[PDB]
Design a protein around this ligand. Structure first.
Ligand code: BCB
Ligand code: BCB
Ligand SMILES: C/C=C1/c2cc3[nH]c4c(c3C)C(=O)[C@H](C(=O)OC)c4c3nc(cc4[nH]c(cc(n2)[C@@H]1C)c(C(C)=O)c4C)[C@@H](C)[C@@H]3CCC(=O)OC/C=C(\C)CCC[C@H](C)CCC[C@@H](C)CCCC(C)C
Ligand SMILES: C/C=C1/c2cc3[nH]c4c(c3C)C(=O)[C@H](C(=O)OC)c4c3nc(cc4[nH]c(cc(n2)[C@@H]1C)c(C(C)=O)c4C)[C@@H](C)[C@@H]3CCC(=O)OC/C=C(\C)CCC[C@H](C)CCC[C@@H](C)CCCC(C)C
Ligand SMILES: CC(C)=CCC/C(C)=C/CC/C(C)=C\CC/C(C)=C/CC/C(C)=C/CC/C(C)=C\CC/C(C)=C/CC/C(C)=C/CC/C(C)=C/CC1=C(C)C(=O)c2ccccc2C1=O
Ligand SMILES: COC1=C(OC)C(=O)C(C/C=C(/C)CC/C=C(/C)CC/C=C(\C)CC/C=C(\C)CC/C=C(/C)CC/C=C(\C)CC/C=C(\C)CC/C=C(\C)CCC=C(C)C)=C(C)C1=O
Ligand SMILES: COC1=C(OC)C(=O)C(C/C=C(/C)CC/C=C(\C)CC/C=C(\C)CC/C=C(\C)CC/C=C(/C)CC/C=C(\C)CC/C=C(\C)CC/C=C(/C)CCC=C(C)C)=C(C)C1=O
Ligand code: HEC
Ligand SMILES: CC(C)=CCC/C(C)=C/C=C/C(C)=C/C=C/C(C)=C/C=C/C=C(C)/C=C/C=C(\C)CC/C=C(\C)CCCC(C)C
Ligand SMILES: CC(C)=CCC/C(C)=C/C=C/C(C)=C/C=C/C(C)=C/C=C/C=C(C)/C=C/C=C(\C)CC/C=C(\C)CCCC(C)C
Ligand SMILES: CC(C)=CCC/C(C)=C/C=C/C(C)=C/C=C/C(C)=C/C=C\C=C(C)\C=C\C=C(/C)CC/C=C(\C)CCCC(C)C
Ligand SMILES: CCCCCCCCCCCC[N+](C)(C)[O-]
Ligand SMILES: CCCCCCCCCCCC[N+](C)(C)[O-]
Ligand SMILES: [Fe+3]
Lengths: 323, 273, 55, 58, 258, 55, 24, 58, 58, 58, 55, 58, 58
């Protein structure tokens, strides 16, 4: 085979050059070290890191959040250290279990949930700023920041916005491995099956889309790596045989192609759209649709199947039923 | 009909099967032997769907469905309307897929590029095969496969997953899901990063490869490097199905309890139980 | 190089001007806080004495 | 030093105002939020709301 | 009475649906697809009938031009009109639109099909400092191989025949990626060094195996203009030669398997 | 053994992390409704917002 | 009202003084 | 310094207005929103609605 | 040394104030938070709340 | 060696104070926390709480 | 290289001026902590005597 | 070698004390924890708790 | 060889003490663990607990 696409056979070492920012060249932190193993898939060098304010802040809120989360998880196993470690995935920080509408709930029932929520929110933001500022610091464009934005917004939607529009904190996602997942099912059951929500559709489309696209783009570049097609930026400004082939390949197959530059747009667009599509769906849910299946039936989208075993009338609705 | 640079590349040869008779382009499409074959399946398979859907009970595009045969028919052929057409299409499907993939091989041969693309395309094909063919073999019926139908297919996914009591816990799934997410995020970053360097805003000069590196080594303190991201993308993408395929095949042939119960192995190590 | 600003040290005076204001305002901040804590006490005496049961 | 007693001031040579300031600012903000919200999720020491405390009443 | 009901059958969800669609298509069409036509358009025609306009809907098609201001001076405008004026040594099988072409002479030297290169700017690729990006390890003395790998310097280069083509002189490094791009070998029999892309050779413990081309055709790998630096065009030239050999080394590489 | 609660619960509900004891909620007495899903496509005005709604 | 509930004054106050006095 | 008593102004040498100014903007906006919203989440101290408070009345 | 008895101080030649200072800041704050939190999670020793302890009562 | 018996001290030439100091600091803290919490997870031996132990009674 | 910051090191004097204050202030804090702990004790005497049952 | 009988010691020329030291440190620590905690998760051989072992009693 | 009978020893010229050593360390540890825990998971052959065995008893 061609081994040079899978891993790197002969590794290189030498002096790395620092691009001086607009500001905060000073707030780079740590002794850069190498990993020979890591060097077989990517660059081996691992430090330094930029610090600065946004960072500081993000960590600040982030940690507080984490602390509140974990601490409460411990409190669930009554602080038994052995049990904690065994039961860890099953432990969580839950939102309120009674109906208080949108009132700040008691500490012991959802209160702590809410606090961690707010702090997680704040870290996300601080981080956002990091991403956005750094870009501007180095004279790049802001695309990453905007993609990241959408992601954050979707977190907001399922965290507080949706709860708000229906007006109960009870609808919040809980913190914890298994329990954040149990949420998914509950939430779906409640809103009459999410497979039937169109935005869930869209989203998934775009998500699989990403799969397809990365596999394709990924594969395409490696296929043309022999002509130095991995040098993607010089290819943009001075088109070489590499991407000429890459283009041709796709044109001869699906019958239209991209450019080396624009394929990146497509990917960036699909990525974004996952998060956006999602957000919409979440906003609509509870607010305008109560039961997504029934809704799909009102617009006759829903498939209907004959009975295999005899059809069963609901017993509640019989003459002389109990309760 | 040609890109300004297209002609110098349009040369004869590098077909896998049957040489020169099929070696031509219709417009921008390259045909080849497998071109022909693909088309044939596509056309027949689609037509077959239509005819089949005509004798359904609806024509709402979401609501149309071609279901596989009952479990009583085993691994045998079923009456055409009672699951047979399902069978038909499934073959046209495979047909199309494979012809598609081989066509790609012919193309790449002609261009002197690597075969990474076709091969990559092989992964989903396999998963299709896993779900429609293997898993049903192992349980001994076609009736274990999924139906063709936009909403219909999801119903299959849905019930399947509740047959083990909470599919979220199935460890194959966990891995696959993780990849799905990482992949998406990573495409976003890769997308953005190129675009930022190329279109830096204002009359700012286009930036260098070093700026790509700097940027990430700032934000998260590591840069995977330019070639390798491509390599890595391909990897993430691919394990979506590679790992999942394990969880899929497992459910039924190798596990019959709820998926959560399976974590018992850890939950129940008698030491700390 | 045998000094504090030895052949362009990267720009901080012998500024205890900063030490000045910093410690000033750190105190004011804590001062105000004490005062305020006192007023609140009068509105809601928070710790409470030990109840009839307890121990 | 401009008529000092200790070296204390020298800290700012070692440590760096900008980073101290910026940190403190976040730090105090965190704590203040913690306290306010934590308080307002009790039953004593919630101002804002009617005395849900049902102090002994009922 | 219901939340989100615009009629007895019309609800706000339903409307949003279409809305969503609308946007998607618009972006796709009125944007993304335009952005795609910055290279290689407008379409060219060497059979068809009096056409200054692709698939129809599209001669707007091309977006208005960008202007990439380049890192080390100068501007590029996209889309462009970059004309191919190499005179291709390719005869047609038929005069037909989309019937394939036959090379007239040696395809590897005449640079056609998989052996064709793009006419890139005849300049050296540069670092952020203004040094040359791609250089050998005679020049980049600061750079080195990682401890724990095989130094290919000294090894025999075995070609497709199973015949030693020559011996490895050097590695060439990308200075801004810390990555090895080329082996520079000494083609035995002549007094010349030829540059092979590292993606065309399987490096072993004892030998470098080159499947791409035959031993005899190492004599004709494109010559470098300078000794210690490589232009962007020379890169494409070198790469295309070996890859072209994947279809043109032996006569049987043409043919189908049966 | 107070630390073991979560597990005592999980094993009762097929090892999922759901945090309710369904015996005491549904089976011990006729005090709860098991049905949670709405029987209409659109949210019905007057049961669909805030403290009108179930948790 | 602070009756032997000097506690918070104690915590808040004491450091406030030695902060004032150690770094002069 | 233009008829100044303190050095305080030197903070702008150390800190950068653009950043200060902008962050403040955000900060303040958040706190604003938290309070506004938080308030209108209660019963006492919600304007914009009838007294759901049911202050003692039921 | 300025009238020192042990070498103690030579630690600061080895160790670095900046790292120590910053670490302690965090370390202490965590331990502090933990203790506070853990206290306000009991039934004795929760100030900020009516004695839900049901001390022996019932 | 200044009035020494063993070579022990040579370890600091091999091992590095900074590593050791730091790691000890952490290690100990962990163990400390483990014990503390572990204890306050029981019924005998929890301070911070009422005797829930129901020591034998019922 | 034959000094402590041997031939233009990145700079730290024989400053145990720092060691002075560091140790002062660390002790103040630990003292204050005791005083505080004493006070709280009077408000909420926390360990408790061993109860009637125990063992 | 100072009156040594074996060559045993040459091991440290082969092996690296720093690795050994560090490994043992960890290794031991873990075993130790396993034993402690593991013991304290039985009914006999749990000190720290009341004998809810209910040894045979009931 | 210093008064040897076989050439056994030459193994270490081939194989590397450090590998063998480090491996054995691990290997034995794992096995040891398996047995220990394994045993303590039975009914007969558990020290560390009350005789769960109900050996013949019922
Ligand atoms: C039984 C329930 C189901 C369900 C329930 C469901 C719900 C309720 C929702 C989705 C949603 C989605 N579902 Mg679905 N789902 C999907 C895939 C998807 C995603 C495309 C999309 C969720 C968006 C996302 O990517 O989240 C992952 C990305 C996230 C969460 C963003 C994270 C970014 C964030 C900045 C992360 C960084 C965090 C920091 C590091 C903070 C650290 C924390 C500290 C402070 C402690 C597939 C492929 C399937 C299949 C194959 O069946 C499926 C079936 C189901 N879903 C089951 C039917 N799903 C969402 C949606 O689209 O609804 C319309 C959604 O709301
Ligand atoms: C209640 C049930 C659930 C469920 C049941 C479930 C099952 C049973 C399976 C998965 C599987 C998967 N699930 Mg899960 N799922 C996932 C995500 C995923 C995917 C990562 C993974 C693989 C999808 C797949 O098999 O593609 C299928 C794609 C295929 C087969 C390729 C088709 C492409 C083909 C080759 C080419 C097609 C060409 C076209 C015909 C051409 C037409 C186009 C035009 C141009 C002509 C998420 C993110 C979620 C969330 C967020 O909750 C979720 C929830 C659920 N899943 C619910 C809990 N899921 C699979 C898995 O891996 O399980 C471990 C799987 O078997
Ligand atoms: C389709 C769109 C996709 C998408 C897109 C994008 N996603 C992005 C970006 C874009 C564009 C970024 O630019 C940004 C980034 O920069 O990446 C490079 C980012 C990010 N997405 C992350 C994770 C992620 N993305 C997910 C999903 C999707 N993303 C969706 C699918 C998921 C899922 C799916 O779950 C996950 C988990 C992080 C890497 C990063 C946030 C960092 C943060 O916000 O920091 C917040 C800071 C903290 C949490 C503080 C950490 C504190 C430590 C651990 C210590 C605590 C210990 C304490 C107890 C004691 C203190 C002591 C201490 C010293 C020990
Ligand atoms: C991890 C790997 C990822 C990945 C990778 C790659 N993906 C690739 C490639 C790579 C590398 C290509 O090189 C190839 C391509 O060309 O690039 C565009 C391709 C392609 N991937 C398509 C769709 C796609 N990728 C999906 C998934 C992933 N991709 C995963 C995530 C999904 C999901 C997830 O649903 C979809 C729908 C087509 C656009 C295209 C082939 C067209 C074809 O196949 O032609 C042949 C067939 C037709 C044009 C029509 C077939 C009609 C048949 C005969 C009968 C009707 C169909 C019947 C089976 C009913 C089913 C419908 C029912 C469910 C309601
Ligand atoms: C005129 C004349 C003589 C007529 C008489 C002749 C006659 C009638 C003859 C007989 C006809 C015959 C025999 C055959 C018909 C022709 C034939 C073979 C047809 C096959 C056609 C067919 C089935 C087409 C369907 C196309 C298809 C399957 C899918 C459409 C594409 C889709 C949905 C793609 C997913 C969306 C997607 C990922 C878009 C991505 C955008 C692009 C362009 C990605 C590709 C791409 C990537 C990924 C890069 O990395 C990249 C890197 C650098 C440069 C470029 C690219 C790039 O373009
Ligand atoms: C060049 O410009 C650019 C850069 O450089 C400037 C960048 O750095 C960057 C990006 C900057 C970065 C820092 C990139 C790093 C970003 C990331 C998201 C990297 C993170 C990746 C991971 C965390 C790995 C993912 C791991 C998980 C999600 C957890 C999965 C959990 C489990 C249990 C998985 C279990 C199974 C596995 C782990 C592996 C299973 C594998 C198999 C079963 C089979 C393996 C298949 C193969 C090996 C392929 C077959 C072999 C051959 C074909 C030879 C970009 C975007 C840009 O393009
Ligand atoms: C000239 O016209 C034509 C063309 O050019 C226009 C063609 O290209 C073609 C295409 C022909 C080719 C060989 C194309 C090149 C070959 C490939 C691309 C390989 C892929 C081909 C396939 C996967 C399948 C093609 C082979 C067949 C359809 C043979 C049919 C075999 C049988 C037993 C049909 C009779 C039905 C029964 C006996 C009932 C029992 C069998 C079942 C229930 C199986 C159905 C259930 C499944 C899950 C199917 C899975 C099994 C497979 C997909 C092989 C044809 C047919 C046509 O003649
Ligand atoms: C043995 C039969 C049976 C099984 C098995 C069963 N259910 Fe049910 N399920 C019921 C009955 C009966 C009801 C309605 C009870 C009532 O009217 O109070 C119900 C109600 C429900 C509801 C509430 C529907 C509504 O109207 O709001 C959901 C959701 C549900 N089941 C999901 C599940 C899931 C998920 C599983 C598998 C984990 C499951 N069920 C297994 C019998 C069953
Ligand atoms: C540059 C120079 C030339 C110009 C000079 C210009 C000037 C004067 C700049 C300085 C002016 C200013 C703004 C100075 C500001 C000084 C400040 C803000 C000092 C702040 C000190 C804050 C301290 C010591 C905070 C200690 C906080 C704690 C101990 C919190 C403990 C919390 C707990 C134990 C748990 C509580 C939480 C719970 C119970 C849930
Ligand atoms: C020349 C030089 C540059 C200028 C001088 C520089 C100056 C002025 C330095 C002095 C200024 C300052 C800020 C000095 C600060 C000194 C400080 C902060 C000392 C801090 C000491 C902190 C100590 C000793 C903390 C000990 C903490 C513990 C023992 C915690 C134990 C926790 C447990 C056992 C677990 C309990 C957990 C549980 C849940 C019960
Ligand atoms: C107006 C008022 C009063 C308040 C507004 C408050 C507000 C903004 C609320 C909104 C809250 C939001 C956005 C909540 C979002 C919650 C979400 C999305 C939770 C989702 C998932 C969380 C998961 C999966 C987390 C599990 C966490 C853990 C198991 C523990 C955390 C630990 C780690 C991740 C490891 C790091 C720790 C290591 C260094 C030791
Ligand atoms: C459900 C999400 C899918 C969104 C649709 C993706 C767009 C496919 C691109 C078609 C390109 C059309 N064309 C040939 C004019 O270029
Ligand atoms: C891909 C997701 C499937 C659900 C989409 C719902 C389709 C609505 C269009 C059907 C026309 C009927 N309608 C809305 C007027 O009632
Ligand atoms: Fe790319």
């Amino acid at each position: 085979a061609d081994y040079q696409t899978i891993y790197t056979q002969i590794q290189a070492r030498g002096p790395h050059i620092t691009v001086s920012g607009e500001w905060g060249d000073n707030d780079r932190v740590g002794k850069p070290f190498y990993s020979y193993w890591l060097g077989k898939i990517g660059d081996a060098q691992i430090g330094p890191i930029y610090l600065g304010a946004s960072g500081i802040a993000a960590f600040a809120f982030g940690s507080t959040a984490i602390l509140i989360i974990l601490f409460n998880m411990a409190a669930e196993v009554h602080f038994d250290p052995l049990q904690f470690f065994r039961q860890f995935f099953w432990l969580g920080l839950y939102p309120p279990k009674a109906q208080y509408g949108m009132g700040i709930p008691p500490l012991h029932d959802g209160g702590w949930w809410l606090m961690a929520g707010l702090f997680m929110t704040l870290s996300l933001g601080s981080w956002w700023i990091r991403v956005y500022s750094r870009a501007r610091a180095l004279g790049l464009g802001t695309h990453i920041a905007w993609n990241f934005a959408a992601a954050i917004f979707f977190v907001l939607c399922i965290g507080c916005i949706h709860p708000t529009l229906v007006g109960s904190w009870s609808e919040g996602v809980p913190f914890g491995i298994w329990p954040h997942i149990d949420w998914l099912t509950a939430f779906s059951i409640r809103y009459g099956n999410f497979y039937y929500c169109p935005w869930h559709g869209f989203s998934i489309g775009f998500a699989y889309g990403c799969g397809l696209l990365f596999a394709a783009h990924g594969a395409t570049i490696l296929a043309v790596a022999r002509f130095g097609g991995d040098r993607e930026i010089e290819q943009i400004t001075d088109r070489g045989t590499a991407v000429e082939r890459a283009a041709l390949f796709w044109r001869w197959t699906i019958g239209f192609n991209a450019t080396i530059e624009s394929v990146h747009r497509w990917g960036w667009f699909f990525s974004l759209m996952v998060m956006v599509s999602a957000s919409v769906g979440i906003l609509l849910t509870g607010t305008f649709v109560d039961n997504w299946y029934l809704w799909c039936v009102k617009h006759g989208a829903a498939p209907d199947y004959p009975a295999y075993l005899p059809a069963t009338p609901d017993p509640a609705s019989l003459p002389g039923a109990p309760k | 009909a040609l890109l300004s640079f297209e002609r110098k590349y349009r040369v004869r040869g590098g077909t896998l099967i049957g040489g020169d008779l099929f070696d031509f382009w219709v417009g921008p499409y390259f045909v080849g032997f497998f071109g022909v074959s693909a088309i044939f399946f596509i056309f027949l398979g689609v037509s077959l769907i239509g005819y089949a859907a005509s004798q359904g009970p609806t024509w709402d595009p979401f609501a149309i469905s071609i279901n596989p045969p009952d479990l009583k028919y085993g691994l045998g052929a079923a009456p055409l309307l009672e699951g047979g057409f399902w069978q038909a299409i499934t073959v046209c499907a495979l047909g199309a897929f494979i012809s598609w993939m081989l066509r790609e091989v012919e193309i790449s041969r002609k261009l002197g590029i690597g075969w990474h693309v076709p091969l990559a395309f092989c992964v989903p094909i396999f998963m299709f095969c896993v779900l429609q063919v293997f898993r049903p073999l192992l349980l001994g019926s076609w009736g274990h496969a999924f139906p063709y139908g936009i909403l219909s297919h999801l119903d299959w996914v849905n019930n399947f997953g509740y047959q083990y009591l909470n599919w979220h816990y199935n460890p194959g799934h966990m891995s696959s899901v993780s990849f799905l997410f990482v992949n998406a995020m990573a495409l976003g970053l890769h997308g953005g990063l190129i675009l930022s360097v190329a279109n830096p805003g204002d009359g700012d000069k286009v930036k260098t490869a070093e700026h790509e590196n700097q940027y990430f080594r700032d934000v998260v303190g590591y840069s995977i490097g330019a070639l390798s991201i491509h390599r890595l993308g391909l990897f993430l993408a691919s394990n979506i199905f590679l790992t999942g395929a394990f969880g899929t095949i497992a459910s039924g042939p190798f596990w019959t309890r709820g998926w959560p119960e399976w974590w018992g192995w850890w939950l129940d190590i008698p030491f700390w139980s | 190089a045998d000094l504090k600003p030895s052949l362009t040290g990267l720009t901080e005076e012998e500024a205890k001007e900063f030490h000045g204001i910093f410690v000033t305002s750190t105190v004011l901040y804590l001062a105000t806080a004490v005062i305020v804590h006192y007023l609140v006490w009068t509105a809601r005496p928070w710790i409470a004495p030990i109840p009839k049961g307890w121990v | 030093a401009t008529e000092y007693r200790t070296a204390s001031w020298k800290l700012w040579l070692i440590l760096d105002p900008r980073r101290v300031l910026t940190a403190l600012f976040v730090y105090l903000t965190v704590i203040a939020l913690l306290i306010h919200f934590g308080l307002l999720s009790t039953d004593r020491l919630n101002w804002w709301e009617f005395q849900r405390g049902l102090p002994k009443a009922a | 009475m219901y939340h989100g009901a615009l009629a007895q059958h019309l609800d706000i969800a339903q409307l949003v649906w279409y809305a969503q669609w609308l946007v998607i298509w618009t972006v796709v069409l009125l944007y993304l697809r335009r952005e795609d036509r910055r290279e290689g358009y407008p379409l060219v025609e060497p059979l068809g009938l009096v056409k200054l306009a692709p698939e129809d809907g599209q001669v707007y098609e091309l977006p208005y031009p960008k202007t990439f201001v380049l890192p080390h001076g100068g501007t590029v405008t996209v889309p462009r009109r970059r004309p191919e004026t190499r005179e291709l040594k390719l005869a047609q099988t038929d005069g037909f639109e989309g019937a394939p072409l036959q090379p007239t002479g040696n395809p590897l030297v005449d640079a056609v099909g998989p052996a064709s290169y793009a006419e890139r700017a005849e300049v050296v690729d540069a670092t952020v400092d203004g040094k040359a990006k791609i250089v050998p390890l005679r020049v980049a003395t600061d750079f080195s191989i990682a401890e724990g790998d095989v130094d290919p310097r000294g090894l025999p280069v075995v070609a497709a025949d199973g015949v030693e083509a020559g011996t490895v002189t050097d590695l060439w490094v990308d200075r801004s990626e810390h990555y090895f791009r080329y082996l520079e070998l000494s083609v035995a029999g002549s007094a010349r060094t030829a540059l092979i892309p590292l993606g065309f050779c399987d490096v072993k413990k004892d030998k470098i195996v080159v499947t791409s081309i035959l031993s005899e055709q190492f004599a004709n790998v494109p010559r470098l203009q300078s000794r210690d630096q490589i232009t962007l065009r020379e890169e494409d030239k070198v790469s295309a030669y070996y890859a072209g050999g994947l279809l043109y080394a032996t006569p049987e590489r043409a043919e189908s398997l049966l | 053994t107070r630390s073991g609660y979560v597990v005592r619960l999980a094993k009762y509900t097929a090892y999922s992390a759901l945090n309710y004891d369904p015996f005491t909620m549904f089976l011990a007495n006729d005090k709860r409704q098991v049905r949670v899903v709405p029987q209409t496509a659109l949210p019905l005005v007057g049961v669909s917002r805030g403290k009108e709604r179930r948790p | 009202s602070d009756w032997n509930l000097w506690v918070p004054l104690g915590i808040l106050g004491i450091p406030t003084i030695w902060i004032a006095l150690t770094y002069r």
